[PDB]
């Protein structure tokens, strides 16, 4: 199954290293990474949606490694698998 | 007082680079308005923030992150009130 | 209670008196919004993404009428109250 | 050359549908874009494009000298 995906999380920015393992991962990955969106909310948190584009098992793989580490919070995906 | 568009080009895993520019940004939250990001290679991000607010204010909050060790590409569009 | 949302959704532009008043309305509305990010996903269709600020009520109500616009697919509102 | 580049321009979109169509037929060229809504009229788009520096001066063609644009400019980010 080919699509997209919507991923969207909060984080604080100065739990440095949780944030580089964020973008790092994004790069490690880029070829699934569209681009992402990032609202800083306050002066403490940060609200990102990432645009995620690929085969749907990998699109949800990577999904999980974000929105299971300690730090991110309100971690969301939604997929949108491949139309007919 | 008006809105501008702040793009440039930096190393991710420059640590103290990265740190300072989204730190930048939130200490001026309120001068932002969003960010796009875009992954360019393995090594380097693009990034897009529109800025919000006083023209003064705007550039030299855009100074403030074109002006950190490491930023490339910097360049500022400034859109004041019409 | 107040916060920020995420709405999300897909749309044909070519059948876009549509197009026009999905912005249209986010203008009538823009107190409420941040900023908008659009994928062109392929020929035919659009994904946007709309960041939404503001009293989590009208978030839902302006998200409901949105999504309720013929041709506007996988509507998805995400919402985020303060905490 | 291949590379990136950023199109930014306001336009009233009361015209929207028009640069969106305009940009699919293009989308391989389309990264994505970001659009504030400035004021009740006028509309803040930024494309990030991605191919041929040729394309993307063609796209880049395609919506800034249509008419009712304004403010726009490119930026070639040619790949270093
Ligand atoms: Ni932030
Ligand atoms: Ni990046
Ligand atoms: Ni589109
Ligand atoms: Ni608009």
Redo the contacts with the bound molecule.
């Keep these: 199954t080919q699509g997209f995906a919507v991923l969207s999380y909060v984080y604080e920015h100065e739990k440095r290293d949780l944030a580089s393992r964020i ?1 790092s991962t ?2 490690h990955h ?1 070829d699934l ?1 569209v681009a ?1 969106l990032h609202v800083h909310i306050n002066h403490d948190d940060c609200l990102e949606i990432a645009v995620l584009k690929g085969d749907m098992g990998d699109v949800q793989h990577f999904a999980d490694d974000v929105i299971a580490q300690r730090g991110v919070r309100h971690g969301h995906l939604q997929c949108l698998p491949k139309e007919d």
Aim: aromatic share 0%; net charge neutral; proline share 0%.
């Design positions: 973008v994004q790069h880029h990474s992402t």
